[PDB]
From a paper:
Loading of MHC-I molecules with peptide by the catalytic chaperone tapasin in the peptide loading complex plays a critical role in antigen presentation and immune recognition. Tapasin, a key component of the PLC, is a 48 kDa transmembrane glycoprotein that bridges the TAP transporter and MHC-I to facilitate peptide loading. Mechanistic insight has been hampered by the lack of detailed structural information concerning tapasin–MHC-I. We present here crystal structures of human tapasin complexed with the MHC-I molecule HLA-B*44:05, and with each of two anti-tapasin antibodies. Movements of the membrane proximal Ig-like domains of tapasin, HLA-B*44:05, and β2-microglobulin accompany the transition to a peptide-receptive state. Together this ensemble of crystal structures provides insights into a distinct mechanism of tapasin-mediated peptide exchange.
HLA-B*44:02 and HLA-B*44:05 (B44:02 and B44:05 hereafter), represent tapasin-dependent and tapasin-independent MHC-I molecules, respectively, based on their cell surface expression in tapasin-deficient cell lines. The two allelomorphs differ at a single residue in the F pocket region, Asp116 in B44:02 and Tyr116 in B44:05. The F pocket is loosely conformed by inclusion of a GlyLeu dipeptide in the folding reaction. This strategy permits greater dynamics of the C-terminal portion of the peptide binding groove potentially allowing enhanced interactions with tapasin.
Numbering used by the authors:
A (entry chain A): 1 to 274
B (entry chain B): 0 to 99
C (entry chain P): 1 to 6
The structure:
């Protein structure tokens, strides 16, 4: 199937508490495989998935150097952002970056990403063309001008069409037992009387990977969008995810409700009832 | 500055079975900035050595963290997740409900 | 693998 590799940078300034912390986490799909934390006692790119551990020491040295250089770069970027927004050096600010690539089943680049936020707000994003930028504001427009001058989009594109997809392809192969295994949701409906008049039907999807799942309730075959409490898909901690969707149903009306589960691990969407 | 308060889910890795070793998870998500204090509480007392996932964030840049510890749920032991964040005037305590 | 450019 299709896959993604994403690196997520968080650079968090913390004036008075040392230099901005720089964290990178790398994911393939919903599998964290690498992390870097400048606050680690010995900051290094660290494997977080077994299949990345076979990458040689040159990989880890190069990736760690990337992250150390990035730590400095993103501290510089935080200073730059302070300037661009006329902000004091007293406040704590966050630069985030997500970049990486989606590949299709054939491993070819489906699309690239390189997007940045400042203080949780979109700042600048490489457009899907991997050639132009969307700057969120005039500060990001300064960045965009700099990056257009520096051909950053072209460099990104070369990475996204090359090393990004190539390394992701390798990771998918090395991690094929897990990265290329969808664990279907174990699904069930629980029944929780609220009162004499109402019961909660909670449709559970547990143990599924990847996280993407559609969990809906229908009443009489009609989607209960507004009447379904849908918890965020949440990590179980064993790589898998959980989600539930609950409906408050009148007592005795449980059979009017069907839970519908779409997940790539399910050959066909499941329909469950209490 | 636009800040986002953590969503909090407290739940187990596997369906709770009293006497069966499990993992107590506190998933904090949707928050910004990333600084967040998460304690797992056993009967109101902070569980020690709680581990947490590496700081990641969602497409909307909001952060998420999984705090987790091995626990053996029982009938009477109340578990909770206590979350503090800049958006919270006081720590938010979400009790662990094995049905959620 | 990362793209270190920054």
């Amino acid at each position: 199937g299709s896959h993604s590799m994403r690196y997520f940078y968080t650079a968090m300034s913390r004036p008075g508490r040392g230099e901005p912390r720089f964290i990178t986490v790398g994911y393939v799909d919903d599998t964290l495989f690498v992390r870097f934390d400048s606050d680690a006692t010995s900051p290094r790119k660290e494997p977080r998935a077994p299949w990345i551990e076979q990458e040689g020491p040159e990989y880890w040295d190069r990736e760690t150097q990337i992250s150390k250089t990035n730590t400095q770069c993103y501290r510089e970027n935080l200073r730059t952002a302070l300037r661009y927004y006329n902000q004091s050096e007293a406040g704590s600010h966050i630069i985030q970056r997500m970049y990486g690539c989606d590949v299709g089943p054939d491993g070819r680049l489906l699309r690239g990403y390189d997007q940045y936020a400042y203080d949780g707000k979109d700042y600048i994003a490489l457009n899907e063309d991997l050639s132009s930028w969307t700057a969120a504001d005039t500060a990001a427009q300064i960045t965009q001008r700099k990056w257009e001058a520096a051909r950053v989009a072209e460099q990104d594109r070369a990475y996204l069409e090359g090393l990004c997809v190539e390394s992701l392809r390798r990771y998918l192969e090395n991690g094929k037992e897990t990265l290329q295994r969808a664990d279907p949701p174990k699904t069930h409906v629980t029944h929780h009387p609220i009162s004499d008049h109402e019961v909660t039907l909670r449709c559970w999807a547990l143990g599924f990977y990847p996280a993407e799942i559609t969990l809906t309730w229908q009443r009489d075959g009609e989607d209960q969008t507004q009447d379904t409490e849908l918890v965020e898909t949440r990590p179980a901690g064993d790589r898998t995810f959980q989600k539930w969707a609950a409906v408050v149903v009148p007592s005795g009306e449980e059979q009017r409700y069907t839970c519908h589960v779409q997940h790539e691990g399910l050959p066909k969407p499941l329909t469950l009832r209490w | 500055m636009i800040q986002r308060t953590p969503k909090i889910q407290v739940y187990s890795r596997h369906p709770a079975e009293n006497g069966k070793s499990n993992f107590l998870n506190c998933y904090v998500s949707g928050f910004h900035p990333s600084d967040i204090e998460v304690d797992l509480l056993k009967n109101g007392e902070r569980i020690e050595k709680v581990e947490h996932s590496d700081l990641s964030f969602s497409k909307d840049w909001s952060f998420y963290l999984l705090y987790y510890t091995e626990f053996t749920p029982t009938e009477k032991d109340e578990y909770a997740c206590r979350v503090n964040h800049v958006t919270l005037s006081q720590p938010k305590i979400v009790k662990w409900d094995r049905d959620m | 693998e990362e793209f270190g450019r920054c």
